[PDB]
Design a protein around this ligand. Structure first.
Ligand code: CU
Length: 309
């Protein structure tokens, strides 16, 4: 936080590192999410290929890195409750304390810059428990990013699944939020995933369904750290398969109905599926906001319901 490392350190011929650090912030209460931005130094296309977390051990619980064109603020920093990005927050990295970080496979890179690519990174740093004192304590937590202009042969992106149609009535023991779209692109290979809900979430499970056979992509309690969990053996998703996902909620202790689709006195059901695709057929993001094949869930594997506390 009195370091001298610089915002751009050119590496070999065609690479560079970007040090994305909080500008000396001071978290005052616990559970605080501060956000900041770095613009890419290049207008042309570029490939994020590695990450080094540089977090203050003492207090930082989680870190997220996003790629987007419109950060919710132009200030040196802001509370992330304001928003992350005004446009798509294309999530690229998540670090949790104790979580394994998930390393990109050799030759996989996120595509940024140029025409489609995100022009800004937005870093989100989550501070759990501050101590009482620490007079004026400045913190410069963040991440360094390895960019290269050398074209990568595998491109990574995010397939996002979200539920927006389903209500949790109060006191209802167990409620299933279900999500499914047909896949219609060139092949993706899912190598990681992260889940997200708020406090009524019990388990999130993601599948590839091919000719009525379910293959597990990943499965997790969303009350654990929302880092990216690795997929033991990467699952290939190809044309005509179906992605299906099930969030299990409860409505216990809840007074009125709770809606799964935004705000804060709301719930959410998101599965972030991180993939790669051969560069020439690739795209950086895909979304599913529907349940096209709802009856299919009568055959969901039993593992999808058994909780993982
Ligand atoms: Cu949320």
């Amino acid at each position: 936080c009195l370091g001298t490392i610089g915002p751009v350190t050119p590496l070999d011929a065609s690479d560079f590192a970007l040090d994305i650090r909080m500008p000396g912030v001071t978290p005052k209460e616990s559970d605080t999410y501060f956000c900041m931005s770095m613009r890419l130094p290049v207008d042309e296309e570029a490939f994020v290929i590695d990450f080094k977390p540089r977090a203050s051990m003492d207090t930082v619980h989680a870190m997220l890195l996003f790629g987007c064109n419109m950060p919710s603020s132009t200030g040196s920093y802001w509370f992330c409750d304001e928003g992350t990005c005004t446009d798509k927050a294309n999530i690229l990295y998540a670090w949790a304390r104790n979580a394994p970080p998930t390393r990109l496979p050799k030759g996989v890179g996120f595509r940024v810059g140029g025409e489609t690519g995100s022009k800004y990174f937005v870093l989100q740093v989550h501070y759990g428990d501050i101590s009482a004192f620490r007079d004026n304590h400045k913190d410069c937590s963040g991440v360094s990013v390895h960019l290269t202009r050398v074209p990568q042969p595998l491109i990574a992106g995010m397939y996002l699944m979200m539920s927006v149609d389903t209500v949790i009535p109060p006191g209802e023991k167990v409620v299933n939020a279900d999500i499914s779209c047909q896949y219609k692109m060139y092949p993706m290979h899912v190598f990681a995933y992260r889940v997200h809900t708020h406090h009524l979430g019990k388990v999130v499970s993601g599948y590839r369904v091919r000719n009525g056979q379910w293959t597990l992509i990943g499965r997790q309690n969303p009350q654990l750290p929302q880092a990216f969990y690795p997929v033991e053996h990467p699952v290939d998703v190809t044309f005509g398969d179906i992605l299906a996902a099930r969030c299990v909620f409860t409505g216990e202790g809840r007074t009125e109905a709770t809606h799964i689709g935004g705000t804060s006195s709301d719930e959410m059901c998101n599965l972030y599926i991180m993939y790669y695709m051969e560069a020439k057929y690739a795209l950086s993001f895909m979304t599913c906001t529907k349940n096209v094949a709802p009856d299919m869930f009568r055959t969901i594997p039993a593992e999808a319901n058994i909780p993982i506390p």
